[PDB]
Every structure is written in structure tokens, then in C-alpha cells.
Design a protein around this ligand. Structure first.
Ligand SMILES: O=C([O-])CCCN1CCC[C@H]1COc1ccc(Oc2ccc(Cl)cc2)cc1
Ligand SMILES: [Yb+3]
Ligand SMILES: [Yb+3]
Ligand SMILES: [Yb+3]
Ligand SMILES: [Zn+2]
Length: 607
């Protein structure tokens, strides 16, 4: 049972295919058209079915060339409104029919962000992008909005002719629009069955540059050169991922660099990964995000969580593969550094929520919880922690990677639960079951807080970050003179970041220490978004007023929630910046991503 969906479940009927024909109307901020769903009955004598919708205007529903009865139920908050459709003829088990629904989105669609020309790089054209995960696909089109159902799709999208449409699918050509020659129709085919949260659409003034034998980078013209360089490791990461996961089945692996308001680091849309422009550090240092999105081509897109309660299956395995990719590229010591880093991020999350909070459980219960509100690092890092602990328990990285590849093979094209996973783990490691029985499963899977066991981490690359962080934390005023730019001499960008992360865990520090840190390390000059984020949080939590305009600027000039949410929260907790934060949020709210606006509003206790 998917408690986040109001639609008929997979045991009742299953969508096999979507044919989407729609037109993107920038004047009205609406997507209008028809979603033709090929639906297969799973029951005898099926006479109706229910679809998810959210802020959709339904014009009509046609089956067998005739309009049929349908009814929209009462809105159920963030879940939207159920759509019951009366079938004209009862279906037997396995019988398929095509249901064509004429619809229109709301400008307020929580799936979509509509951007004015001024919010783009070029300033001459508007831009649209979607984000369906977890349950926003219903805010674009009527569907069974559950990852328990997988469907193929085709789409024809009409857009102003100077713009380009892209989707999570293979590009299938373009033509002038036969009805309106000011428009183009872009065609798309996704022949691999996918859960509907992986349907994605972007429309804007996009250009492309090839960076590998199966990868183009797409963005507005002013970001193309920078993006091509930043993501040049992509093909070599795909080859490693294929080695670990098996064949890449999706054909193309393209990248789209979104405008700065994209709410996340990345999104693993099949054939077309979406990435934040905050990755454009200039030195490829934030490329683990690409490795992570690549990994989803197996863990998430092939093997999918059956409901959102099992989201950790998607993320833990993907972070696990991610860290293997970076370990192949840069060494096993680097994999351990990143893994130990992740544990720190897990400590932070658990401390933030509280150690008994239900969202610190690996397997969660999302009944009456908005998944956007539950979203955190917990399923990523507690899920990774579990796999890493199992790896060490069961004999090492190469043994456990044998299991990961067998897992992907086993559940490819399926949607699975934690029990499916656990069962297969026991099946695969039959000769090591006694060891498996030592694991405290009820704690790992179902209890809040930090895991019952912390894995073993090589400390080599972390030691210098910890030592430097500890010098600063234990420094008194008379020690401040001893710090100097040479302290940073032998630290990579990642170590610099971890140094700040270590220090941030003990924030606030005395204001005088922070002022000195700027004087000798000039952190204000660093444009690496991850480093800058932690440095600004450290400044604001340590009550440095000078940092207020910098923190406000970063919070608003990009919209990646990882950065924007804690920056607004920190600014609101600082009495000197509190009113500015609230005011800045209020003035920016209408032009923010709708999900980001909602969550920042909640964080700030506004509107
Ligand atoms: O590949 C990635 O992990 C990129 C980060 C994921 N981003 C990409 C755009 C969408 C977003 C994931 O969005 C979600 C995903 C899952 C959500 O629901 C849950 C939130 C927490 C839990 Cl423990 C279970 C389910 C809610 C929102
Ligand atoms: Yb074709
Ligand atoms: Yb002293
Ligand atoms: Yb108010
Ligand atoms: Zn992920």
C-alpha cells in the first residue's frame, strides 16, 4: 500500500504507457494537453479506477472515442485530489485500454517552476523546469503517482520556436507545429519502464556541447563552456558505474545545468540528469554529485523503492556506489574520507531532528507526512552507514560489490521493499547467515537515532582537518597570532570543507576567532559553494554582523535547499539578522521554487 498516493494500487490496475501531447503556455504559466494512459486491469470485472491529481483542471476523459464520467474527490492537502473514472465497459484481468485525459496545470503547480526572462542567464527568454520526485507528477498530469508502478512513455511537446524542450527520454526529432508556426514540437521516447517521478521536462533557450561518447551537456549559452569542463569526468564515471552495476540501459547520459533556483544538487532523470549550477566550482571538486546521479541509473531507476517509506533503498545504495566510483578515481583512502564525512552529516541530522524523532528511522512511515517535509540526509547516510557496516561484516568491498551487482540484476525493472532487499541479502550470503544474524536489524531499520554500530573508517585524510579544527576550538586569544595562511598549504578543497564541517559542529566560536580566520584564510574569497556555505553558517552562528549581507546574498542568489534552508534558519536565529531574513524571504517568496518557498516558510514560521 502506497500511503502517499490516492490512486488505484498496482494490485488493482497498472499503467503500462503514457503518451503525452502538450503545449507549454508561458503567457498563462500552464501546460495544456492530453495524457493517454494505457492501463492494464489486474482484476476481474474492473469498472472504475482512481488517479492522483493536484491542482489540475480536467476538461474531459475519452475512452473508445467517447467522453466518459469522472469525478474529482475532495482535496487531501499535499496529496491533492483523487480522480475517479467510470470505465465504459468492465475489464477482465490483464485487459488493457487507453484512457485519454484532457487537462491543464495550475501556475501554482508544485511540480513546476516558471521563470521570467530576468531570472535566466540570457535575460531574453523565459524558462520552465519540472521536478516530480517524490509525489509532484500528479501536479503535472493525472497518473498513478506511486513508484510501485512503472511505465514507458512517449511525448510531443509544443513550445515557442526559439526555445528547446528536453525530457527524461531519448530525443526523437523536432518539427514546426502544424497548428501554429510560431511554435515547435519536440518529440521524445522513453522505452525503459520507469516510475512516474522520473518524468521530467525543461523548456528554455538551451544549447548543448558534447563531452563524451554518450553525453551532451545542456544549459543556457553562458554556462556551456564552464559546465563542459566541470563535468568532464562523466564518461569515466559511467564506465566505472557500468563495471560495478552492469550494463547502462538508458542509451544517452546527458546533463542539464539548471538555473540557480533548482532546489537540489542533482536529480537522476533518465537520459538527462539535472544538476545545480552551484556545482560549477571551476575545478571539478563537486563531481561526486555526478557520480551519485550516474549511480541512480541502477539503484533507483532500475531497482526502485516500492513506496516512499523505503526511500533509503534508493539513496543508501546510490551513495554506496557513488563512494565506490570516487574511490576508484581517487583512492580507497578518499572513499573512507567521504564515508567518514557522511557519518558526520548523519550526526548533524540526528542532532537537528532529535535522537528519538521518527524521521531518523531508516524505514519511515509516511502516512499523513508530506515527503518534502520528511526529506533529510538520514536515508542517504544511515542507509550508507548500514551498507558500509555490512561490507565490513561480510568480508570487504569486493565481496559486497558482488552482492550489489547481483541485487541490481535481481530487481531490475521492479519496485521493491526493505523486506525484498533483506531477503535477497540473506539469500545471497547464505554461507554467512550466522554473521547476518548478529546484525541488530530492528535497531538498524526501525529505531530512531544514530545506528547501533559505527563502521571502521580509515582516518588518514581526515586527521589534518580534525587537528586544525581542534587548534582553533582550543585556541585562546593569545593563540590567534599563531594561525597563518600556511596552515592550509597541504589541504585539498575537500579537506578545507571538512575542516569547516568539523568546526561548524562546535559552533559558535568566539567572534574574535572567526574574524581572525577571515584575516588569515580569507574564506570570504572562496566561491566553492560547499565551503562558502559552511563558512557563512559558521560566521552567522558565531554572530559576525559583517557576514549578514553575504549569507543573505548566497541564500537568495541560488536556491539549492541544502544551502538556502540552513542559511535562512541561521539568519533567523541571529537576532541582528532576524527581521532581514523574514523580510528577504517575504519579498522573494513569489519568485522562489514552490517547494523551496513552502519549506523556508515553515522553517521561518512565516505566512
Ligand atoms: O539524486 C538525489 O538524491 C538528488 C536529491 C533528490 N532530490 C532530487 C529532486 C527531488 C529530490 C528528492 O525528492 C524527494 C525524495 C524523497 C522524498 O520523500 C522521502 C523523504 C524522506 C524519506 Cl526517509 C523517505 C521519503 C521527498 C522528496
Ligand atoms: Yb526516431
Ligand atoms: Yb595562553
Ligand atoms: Yb503572517
Ligand atoms: Zn540520490
Amino acid at each position: 500500500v502506497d500511503t502517499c498516493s490516492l490512486a488505484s494500487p498496482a494490485s488493482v490496475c497498472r499503467t503500462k504507457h503514457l503518451h503525452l501531447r502538450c503545449s507549454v503556455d508561458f503567457t498563462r504559466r500552464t501546460l495544456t494537453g492530453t495524457a493517454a494512459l494505457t492501463v492494464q486491469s489486474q482484476e476481474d470485472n474492473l469498472r472504475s479506477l482512481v488517479l492522483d491529481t493536484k491542482d489540475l483542471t480536467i476538461e474531459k476523459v475519452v475512452i473508445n472515442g467517447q467522453e466518459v464520467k469522472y469525478a474529482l474527490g475532495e482535496r487531501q492537502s499535499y496529496k491533492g485530489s483523487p480522480m475517479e473514472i467510470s470505465l465504459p465497459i468492465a475489464l477482465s484481468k490483464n485487459q488493457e485500454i487507453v484512457i485519454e485525459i484532457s487537462f491543464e496545470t495550475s501556475p501554482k503547480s508544485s511540480a513546476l517552476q516558471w521563470l521570467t526572462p530576468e531570472q535566466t542567464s540570457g535575460k531574453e527568454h523565459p524558462y520552465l523546469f519540472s521536478q516530480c520526485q517524490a509525489i509532484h507528477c500528479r501536479a503535472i498530469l493525472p497518473c498513478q503517482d506511486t513508484p510501485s508502478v512503472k511505465l514507458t512513455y512517449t511525448a510531443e511537446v509544443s513550445v515557442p520556436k526559439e526555445l528547446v524542450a528536453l525530457m527524461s527520454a531519448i530525443r526523437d526529432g523536432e518539427t514546426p507545429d502544424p497548428e501554429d508556426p510560431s511554435r515547435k514540437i519536440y518529440k521524445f521516447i522513453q522505452k525503459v519502464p520507469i516510475p512516474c517521478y522520473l518524468i521530467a521536462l525543461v523548456v528554455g533557450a538551451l544549447e548543448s556541447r558534447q563531452i563524451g561518447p554518450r553525453t551532451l551537456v545542456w544549459s543556457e549559452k553562458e554556462q556551456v563552456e564552464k559546465s563542459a569542463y566541470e563535468f568532464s569526468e562523466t564518461e569515466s564515471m559511467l564506465k566505472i558505474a557500468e563495471d560495478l552495476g552492469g550494463p547502462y540501459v538508458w542509451g544517452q547520459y546527458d546533463l542539464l545545468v539548471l538555473p540557480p533556483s533548482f532546489p537540489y544538487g542533482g536529480m537522476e532523470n533518465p537520459c538527462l540528469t539535472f544538476v545545480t549550477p552551484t556545482l560549477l566550482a571551476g575545478d571539478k571538486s563537486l563531481s561526486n554529485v555526478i557520480a551519485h546521479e550516474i549511480s541512480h541509473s541502477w539503484t533507483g531507476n532500475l531497482v526502485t523503492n516500492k513506496t516512499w517509506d523505503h526511500f533509503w533503498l534508493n539513496e543508501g545504495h546510490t551513495v554506496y556506489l557513488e563512494r565506490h566510483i570516487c574511490g576508484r578515481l581517487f583512492g580507497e583512502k578518499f572513499r573512507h574520507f567521504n564515508a567518514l564525512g557522511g557519518w558526520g552529516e548523519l550526526q548533524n541530522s540526528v542532532k537537528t531532528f532529535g535522537e528519538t524523532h521518527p524521521f531518523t528511522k531508516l524505514v519511515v512511515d509516511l502516512t499523513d507526512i508530506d515527503p518534502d517535509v520528511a526529506y533529510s540526509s538520514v536515508p542517504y547516510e544511515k542507509g550508507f552507514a548500514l551498507l558500509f557496516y555490512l561490507e565490513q561484516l561480510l568480508g570487504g568491498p569486493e565481496i559486497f560489490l558482488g552482492f550489489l551487482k547481483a541485487y541490481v540484476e535481481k530487481f531490475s525493472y521492479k519496485s521493491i521493499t526493505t523486506d525484498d532487499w533483506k531477503d535477497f541479502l540473506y539469500s545471497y550470503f547464505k554461507d554467512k547467515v550466522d554473521v547476518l544474524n548478529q546484525v541488530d536489524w530492528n535497531a538498524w531499520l526501525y529505531s530512531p537515532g544514530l545506528p547501533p554500530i559505527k563502521p571502521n573508517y580509515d582516518m588518514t585524510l581526515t586527521n589534518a582537518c580534525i587537528a586544525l579544527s581542534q587548534r582553533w576550538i582550543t585556541a585562546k586569544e593569545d593563540d590567534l597570532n599563531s594561525f597563518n595562511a600556511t596552515d592550509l598549504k597541504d589541504l585539498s578543497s575537500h579537506q578545507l570543507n571538512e575542516f569547516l564541517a568539523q568546526t561548524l559542529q562546535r559552533a559558535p566560536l568566539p567572534l574574535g576567532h572567526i574574524k581572525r580566520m577571515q584575516e588569515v584564510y580569507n574564506f570570504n574569497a572562496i566561491n566553492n559553494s560547499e565551503i562558502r556555505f559552511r563558512w557563512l553558517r559558521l560566521c552567522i552562528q558565531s554572530k559576525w554582523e559583517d557576514a549578514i549581507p553575504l549569507a543573505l546574498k548566497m541564500a537568495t542568489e541560488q536556491g539549492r535547499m541544502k544551502f538556502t534552508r540552513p542559511l535562512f534558519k541561521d539568519l533567523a536565529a541571529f537576532d541582528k539578522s532576524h527581521d532581514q531574513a523574514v523580510r528577504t524571504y517575504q519579498e522573494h517568496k513569489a519568485s522562489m521554487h514552490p517547494v523551496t518557498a513552502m519549506l523556508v516558510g515553515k522553517d521561518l514560521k512565516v505566512d
